[PDB]
Design a protein around this nucleic acid. Structure first.
Lengths: 204, 203, 174
RNA sequence: ACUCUAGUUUGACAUUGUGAAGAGACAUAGAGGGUGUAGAAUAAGUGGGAGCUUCGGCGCCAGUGAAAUACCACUACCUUUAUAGUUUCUUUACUUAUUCAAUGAAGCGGAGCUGGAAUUCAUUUUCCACGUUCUAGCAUUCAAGGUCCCAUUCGGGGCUGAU
RNA sequence: UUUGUAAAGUGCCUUCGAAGAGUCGAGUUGUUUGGGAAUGCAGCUCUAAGUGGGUGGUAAAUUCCAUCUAAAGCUAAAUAU
RNA sequence: UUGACCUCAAAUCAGGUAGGAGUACCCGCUGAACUUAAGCAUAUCAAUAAGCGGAGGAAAAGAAACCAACCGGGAUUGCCUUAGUAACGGCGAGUGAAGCGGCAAAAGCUCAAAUUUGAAAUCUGGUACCUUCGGUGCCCGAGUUGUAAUUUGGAGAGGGCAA
């Protein structure tokens, strides 16, 4: 049971001395192969925000560059091209669509590296910009499977009370367990080294 | 009670305690005779559930039997027949070694009646058994009717007609589709199905 | 050792079971009492005998009712008594391994006993019982893990021991 | 000739344990190690992230590169076994299983005494003996000598002789 | 003689409910069977389990079901002569 | 030093028991070959004769770790049928059961595994007496490394309640 330890709860709130937004970090554990397709390739909806600052480089076109003046972070176009390739790095993640797929070959060397662009794995080029902006400013997690065995993500903030953080780590355990392929070993939740940013690690 | 602990200890025979006790006891029993009296059972749980009520007139013998296949007689390995029935070495003796042990200690103690027998030990050369013989004309057995049935004259030499616990095993007797050739005893259910039944009015 | 064993068997000499003549005496007592006073087997006082028998002592250790349990450095079918130090450590009952199953038999009027157990005790000998429990747990039940780790045996005979001493003094020293 | 067969030869498993050598990695944490471009700077990769410590100091930002750090962790990469159990190799070493032989199971092993080969580098560091050799004789009575008892009877007992 | 404040059975609730290992099972080998990728026995080798085990007549894995309790024991008459 | 314990012995110790015969039928081990295949090496005869160990008036088997797959049957044995069938077989010669169904006969049960622990309550032998295939007292002995009572798979145990 996750009730005797903290794992999302009130018990670890005074262990860290930084009075800034410090988020909790959960790490999954299930052995896989050296392939690139197997595993947990899904980024679901996180119901409570991660409480982070992020600005979006919306480089849209005719039918989608109007809904950014109500609920968004930054309004950009496809004409401003001589900035996002050479100098500027003031971003956390972007958001694109399907209508302009010939500009994506240009911003490869600068943004694909530090996770500022999209290759194939995150739902970044989603068309809908009138309903999916109530899901990205409430910052989601990062499910990114590495080489041999780890899955480093982030659930919530330690200073947030245990009322908002009661059904967030449970719906995230129902994503890496049901969408998973049949090439994972026994008892898919093996080890959960859960440490936030500053205190000790609290595991099951 | 204390017999469940002995039962569960005796079910773990490759642990360190039981292999030390195995080695000490196999040496001690090899230093003695083949058929010799045991003053007291070495497995009181396993002797007790086979029928050892420790009182007067119950006897434990301990017995070695020579281990391995049954090499045939017929001198210099010649059988003088078909090349089917021509093997001398690899023949394997339809009764168990436990039945040989029971028959031998029922021939030495010939006044006594064998009830059952159990395994105590083995090395590469011998298997060692304890046989649990009952003296049927002692007055602590001839009454108290839980054990006076062994007094009956039909129970003479149970170990040499196949009526002990390993006798009825090695005779193939059990219920089933698996035991069809030998379920009522093999040779009676052979002779009754090679009998030509002919009536008065021929059916 | 013999000092604590002598104290322990003074204490267990104070608690012996009934011999046959004492049972004949209490049969005469209850045969008078039930026929006259109609006291159904309660005119005689409650006994305080030692508890003996191996199934009995194992049931008393399983139900936590035994105060003190003695074990013999004995019985040749050893499997009868190797599980009793583990039971007595697991159930918290203080236990000692006293020398001889003849003495455990003669403080109980048998030939061999192989177990002994106090469950009841009168109010006279309580402090002596507690001092025995203290000394016994200083020797046995608090050293259970250290003894469970160590391997005995390997002791060579004195001719091979002397030859090993000669060689291992001639292999390193001069 | 076709098909076998007792015997014998060799391997594997068991009987079959116990110490000391030599390689494979686990319970067991941590000191440190891991230099193709760019970037204060040796970022093997990933997650949080604009701040912490009294201060200093670093960090956000800035800029860079496939990877942005102060601060706490996971997977790992190469060593370090200081701690305990198991893998095949040295045939090294063990007595208790097992095997051989001998005797009516007679002197096995260890230590000392005295001497002396032995030279003293402070006192013995060491090693050997520890009853018999001209003779076709003898060797046996809990053993004679020496010592102490008993209650002095005619005898009987203990030590030593023979560590 | 009345063997006797003893024994036995029936109904309701509660806590339990102990059940047989070098044995089951398996590999190989011999033998046997009608038993067919091994029916029974036996030799060696390995060796269990507990909401378990065995059987369900083509070997195997996966998910269910069914049916009985092994490795301890006694017992008339039908039957053979 | 004396007394127990354990293990092992000795007695023309007290009292018992075993062997041998008969073997028609029974329970096991062991086990051929003539012959058949129009030859013969698997096969077949045959799981037979011979040999050996053991009983009884019957023996054996027997109260399902069974058969089934049905609307399920219910220990064992034997008879009629299944059935010359399914199956095995140089798929040759040949071999060859079982469940169901009708009937004869139907009888069910016992230990081990749970402290009786306000009481080994159990059993043997000797001695004395007698209403002497046995009963009572006393005395040793067995036995708590555990005999009796309670329970045994279908139930059952410890408690509580009313008949």
């Amino acid at each position: 049971v996750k009730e005797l330890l903290k794992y999302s709860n009130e018990t670890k709130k005074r262990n860290f001395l930084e009075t800034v937004e410090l988020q909790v970090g959960l790490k999954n554990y299930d052995p896989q192969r050296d392939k690139r397709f197997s595993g947990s390739l899904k980024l679901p909806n996180c119901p409570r925000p991660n409480m982070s600052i992020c600005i979006f480089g919306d480089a849209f076109d005719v039918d989608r560059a109007k809904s950014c003046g109500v609920d968004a972070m930054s309004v950009d176009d496809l004409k401003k091209l001589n900035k996002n390739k050479k100098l500027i790095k003031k971003l956390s993640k972007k958001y694109n669509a399907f209508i302009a797929s010939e500009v994506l070959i240009k911003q490869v060397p600068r943004l694909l590296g530090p996770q500022l662009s999209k290759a194939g794995k995150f739902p970044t080029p989603v068309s809908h910009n009138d309903d999916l902006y109530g899901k990205v400013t409430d910052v989601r997690s990062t499910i990114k499977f590495q080489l041999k065995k780890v899955l480093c993500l982030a659930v919530a903030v330690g200073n947030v009370e245990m009322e908002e953080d009661v059904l967030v780590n449970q719906i995230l355990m129902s994503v890496n367990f049901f969408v998973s392929l049949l090439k994972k070993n026994w008892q898919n939740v093996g080890s959960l080294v859960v440490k936030s940013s500053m205190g000790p690690a609290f595991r099951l | 009670g204390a017999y469940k602990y002995l039962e569960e200890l005796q079910r773990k025979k490759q642990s360190d305690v039981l292999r030390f006790l195995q080695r000490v006891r196999v040496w001690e029993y090899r230093q003695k005779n083949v058929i010799h009296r045991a003053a007291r059972p070495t497995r009181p749980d396993k002797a007790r559930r086979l029928g050892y009520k420790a009182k007067q007139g119950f006897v434990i013998y301990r017995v070695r039997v020579r281990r391995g296949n049954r090499k045939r007689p017929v001198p210099k390995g010649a059988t003088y027949g078909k090349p089917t029935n021509q093997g001398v070495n690899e023949l394997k003796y339809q009764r168990s070694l436990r039945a040989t042990a029971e028959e031998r200690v029922g021939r030495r103690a010939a006044n006594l009646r064998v009830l059952n027998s159990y395994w105590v030990n083995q090395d590469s050369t011998y298997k060692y058994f304890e046989v649990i013989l009952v003296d049927p004309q002692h007055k602590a057995i001839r009454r108290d009717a839980r054990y006076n049935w062994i007094c009956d004259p039909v129970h003479k030499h149970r170990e040499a007609r196949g009526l002990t616990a390993t006798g009825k095993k090695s005779r193939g007797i059990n219920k089933g589709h698996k035991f069809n050739n030998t379920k009522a005893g093999r040779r009676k259910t052979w002779k009754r199905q090679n009998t030509l039944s002919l009536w008065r009015y021929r059916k | 050792d013999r000092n604590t064993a002598a104290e322990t068997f003074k204490l267990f000499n104070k608690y012996r079971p009934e011999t046959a003549a004492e049972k004949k005496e209490r049969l005469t007592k209850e045969a008078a009492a039930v026929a006259e006073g109609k006291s159904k087997q309660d005119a005689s006082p409650k006994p305080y005998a030692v508890k003996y028998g191996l199934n009995h002592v194992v049931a008393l250790i399983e139900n936590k009712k035994a105060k003190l349990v003695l074990i013999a450095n004995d019985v040749d079918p050893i499997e009868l008594v190797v599980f009793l130090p583990a039971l007595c450590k697991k159930m918290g009952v203080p236990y000692a391994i006293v020398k001889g199953k003849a003495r455990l038999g003669t403080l109980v009027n048998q030939k061999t006993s192989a177990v002994a157990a106090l469950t009841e005790v009168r109010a006279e000998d309580e402090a002596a019982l507690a001092k025995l429990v203290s000394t016994i747990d200083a020797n046995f039940a608090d050293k259970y893990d250290e003894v469970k780790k160590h391997w005995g045996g390997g002791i060579l005979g004195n001719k091979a021991q002397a030859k090993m001493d000669k060689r291992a003094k001639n292999s390193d020293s001069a």
